[PDB]
A paper describes a structure:
To combat these defenses, Anopheles mosquitoes produce inhibitors belonging to the SG7 protein family that block complement at the alternative C3 convertase, C3bBb. Crystal structures of albicin and SG7.AF reveal a novel four-helix bundle arrangement that is stabilized by an N-terminal hydrogen bonding network. In this study, we describe the structures of albicin and its orthologs SG7.AF (from An. freeborni) and anophensin (from An. stephensi), characterize the binding and mechanism of AP inhibition by these inhibitors, and determine a role for properdin in modulating the inhibitory activity of SG7.AF. SG7 family members are quite similar to one another structurally, but amino acid sequence divergence suggests that specific side chain interactions are key determinants for the observed differences in target affinity.
Here we show that SG7.AF, the albicin homolog from An. freeborni, has a similar potency to albicin but is more active in the presence of properdin, a plasma protein that acts to stabilize C3bBb. The backbone structure of SG7.AF is very similar to that of albicin (RMSD = 0.51 Å), with the lengths of the helices and positions of the cysteine residues being essentially the same. SG7.AF also contains an N-terminal structure identical to that of albicin where the amino group is stabilized by means of the same hydrogen bonding network. The IC50 value for SG7.AF was similar to that of albicin in NHS but increased by sixfold in PDS suggesting a role for properdin in its mechanism of action. Identically to albicin, SG7.AF showed no ability to inhibit the CP. The fact that SG7.AF remained inhibitory, albeit less so, in the absence of properdin indicates that it does not function simply as a scavenger of properdin, but rather is made more potent in its anti-C3bBb activity by properdin. Like albicin, SG7.AF did not block the activation of factor B by factor D (conversion of C3bB to C3bBb) demonstrating that it targets the C3bBb complex directly, rather than inhibiting the serine protease responsible for its activation. Together, these data suggest that SG7.AF acts similarly to albicin in that it inhibits the catalytic activity of the C3bBb complex by directly interacting with it. When injected along with C3b, factor B, and factor D, SG7.AF and albicin both cause an enhanced accumulation of C3bBb on the surface, but SG7.AF was required at higher concentrations, indicating a lower-affinity binding interaction for this inhibitor.
Author numbering: 1 to 119
Write the structure that this text describes.
Amino acid sequence: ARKHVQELLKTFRRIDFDETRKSVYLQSAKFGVQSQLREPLTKKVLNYWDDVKLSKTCLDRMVTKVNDVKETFYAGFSYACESHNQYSVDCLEAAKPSYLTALGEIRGETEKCLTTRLK
Ligand SMILES: [Cl-]
């Protein structure tokens, strides 16, 4: 239901982005989270009946996993890129497919743990 969308988006608010980083990177980083996680998971929880309980531990793990995957993407765009000039579009594009795939794996893991029992 709507309340589950709100609780899920509260968790997405905790997936922060460093706005001092290059805009070309930020656009790709944000798109990845939106397309691989925010849209499909919001659609999923919208279906839940009014009193479904979400697992807080599941949500918390999504946050840390995404933050690690995103830092890895940023490293490949910037200070760990050896294939092209650092901070280049070529570094970004070389690191982007594995970023998106890793976010997709987080989606599947999160879907499995999202709901829990009442108590
Ligand atoms: Cl909370």
